[PDB]
């Protein structure tokens, strides 16, 4: 982490090239923003030295530093030591899929909508009308209801839409509810039953 920080800041010329463990070259010299993906993994380090130093320089009056962390765990507060927790500004934002099924249908309708910057305009309008018509089809709504009950995450919706669009060819420029049914069926099959089906007689006995 220290090597990456030094290299991204282009201070290796100032700090030095060798593997020397001294970091006071940066620490004494230390507006720069920090982004930390998978913040939970840093809490499992031996002494949480990097997090403590970042919080200290954030609370110090030398230079302005903004710290942003991302986490999937809801218990990120208890994975920190008392000192860093005290020095941590209790600023939390929560990202929940707080929307109903009709809003999910609206999201699906908008996501598969062509942008206004496409060259052909009448084709785009026909595509928008087609997706609007497919919005209220009860088979499409059934598939969306099933997937919405399973999970509200947009990543699965994007995957399902990509798999559905894979079956779009020249002969079929516009999708069909049967295509979405096929994609939903393909996405929701159990592997254990398939593996058992692939066996032989002796294994079955």
């Amino acid at each position: 982490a220290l090597k990456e920080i030094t290299r991204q800041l282009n201070l290796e010329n100032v700090v030095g090239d060798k593997v020397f463990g001294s970091f006071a070259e940066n620490l004494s010299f230390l507006p720069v923003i920090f982004i930390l993906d998978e913040f939970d993994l840093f809490a499992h380090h031996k002494n949480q030295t990097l997090l403590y130093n970042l919080f200290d320089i954030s609370q110090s009056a030398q230079t302005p530093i903004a710290v942003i962390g991302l986490t999937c765990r809801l218990d990120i507060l208890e994975l920190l030591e008392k000192r860093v927790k005290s020095r941590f500004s209790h600023r939390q934002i929560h990202l929940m899929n707080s929307f109903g099924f009709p809003q999910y249908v609206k999201i699906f309708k908008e996501q598969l909508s062509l942008p206004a910057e496409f060259p052909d305009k009448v084709f785009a309008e026909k595509w928008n009308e087609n997706v609007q018509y497919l919005s209220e089809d009860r088979s499409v709504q059934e598939v969306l209801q099933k997937h919405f009950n399973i999970s509200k995450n947009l990543r699965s919706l994007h995957m399902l839409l990509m798999l559905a669009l894979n079956r779009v060819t020249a002969s079929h420029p516009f999708m069909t509810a049967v295509d979405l049914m096929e994609a939903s069926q393909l996405c929701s099959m159990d592997s254990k039953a398939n593996i058992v089906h692939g066996l032989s007689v002796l294994e079955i006995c």
């Binding site: 809801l74 929560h94 929940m96 899929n97 009950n149 399973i150 999970s151 509200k152």
Partner: peptide, 12 residues
């Protein structure tokens, strides 16, 4: 925030 996270959970 456990209570609100549980409240906003899915039906399943």
């Amino acid at each position: 925030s456990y209570i609100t996270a549980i409240k906003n959970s899915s039906v399943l």
